[PDB]
Symmetry: C6
Subunit: 98 residues, 6 copies
């Protein structure tokens, strides 16, 4: 699956984009993270062409209400990019152990 | 049933808003928040019209005692939203 | 009972105003929450007027110690505000 | 019965401050604190005047190393301050 | 082995780097620390030749997606570095 | 024993300097720390001239990858500093 994300400086701006994203296309919202500075990021997985459209509409709704800084998509997430980023669906590592 | 929120720089603006918000219409305050930064956000959920009123009161009520950043209401939050954001009635 | 609250940008100013605040008149320091940002805020609850005297003086003493962001008071803090901000009696 | 503080933008400017304070006079360093924005505060307790020499010396040692933002001292802190502020003797 | 890292302002730029790093060459992505004002840093470890191919590609691909604040590889970090920084093979 | 320390803004910068720092003279990296705004420090102890040279190399190594806030040495840390700062050998 593709990785879509947008990062905003300003939460409210973030939630709105997350709303429009998951509304735009067939993409789930595998979570969000903030890292200080007021910067904070939301991330989604889906059909590549889904995550493309969602982010696109995400950036829109974001610019409208707040300060959007960056948006980007990644058709080919590195496998091991996960054990390190909230980019995960729950592969049930722990609920997978039983 | 709907979701209104406002984003400040300044806690004291955010608390004033909250207060105008609930006090302005029929909408329960479901989450405050922070993102490092000095920025933090308050949340409410009620009738579409309810949230627009309180949002309107808070934005204004904060305009006066500090920095306002953002107001918005989302009439019909996508379900996915809630599992991620502090946005539900517990 | 009313709610007084001051907010600054620097802990020193802050613990300073709270000290006037509590010294000025009939009020009790009840919470302090930090947004990081270098913004920090204190909270006290007296009879409305005891929170005006109290604040007024707090912001003063603060400003000499440096950078102050907000002062404000709310005589009748909406009820469910308590359950979301460190404003509560205890 | 004397409470000296220093506030810096930068840790190494504060670890210096404290080092000179404890050294200058007979005041007991009862805790550090940080509040985002790279601001943080060192606290010390002693003889009123002893807090004055110690502050004057530590403030001054930081102004050389870097970013100094606050130096104050309260000879007679309310008791409310202890239970909320980390100035506690321990 | 060698240790290369990239530091960004922005998590997104960051996430892209790592992804282009782990792709560019024979390197294992071993860490991501994070600090204030949204600077987050990313660790990797491999052939010193290989930590170059990667830091170069990860530096680049961030460049276009946002704010890069530093690239560097250390061929042979001291053993100390290990016990005080997220570099270690876990 | 003394104390060398070299504060930054930017982690990667701080890594290179802890490395070279510990690589310059004989000294022990006793620990690190951040306090927001993305300032952070490393802290080592060793024979006092150890620290002079090491700090001094970390400062150069640092001045280049990124931005350096503070270097300093305090040959004779007041024993008190140590129960409040990540300064000790544990």
């Amino acid at each position: 699956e593709a990785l879509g994300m947008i990062e905003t400086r300003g939460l409210v701006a973030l939630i709105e984009a997350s709303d429009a994203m998951v509304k735009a296309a067939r993409v789930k919202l595998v979570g969000v993270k903030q890292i200080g500075g007021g910067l904070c990021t939301a991330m989604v997985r889906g059909d590549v062409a889904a995550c493309k459209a969602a982010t696109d509409a995400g950036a829109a709704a974001a610019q409208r209400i707040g300060e959007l800084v960056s948006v980007h998509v990644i058709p080919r997430p590195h496998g091991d990019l996960e054990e390190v980023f909230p980019i995960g669906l729950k592969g049930d590592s722990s609920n997978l152990h039983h």
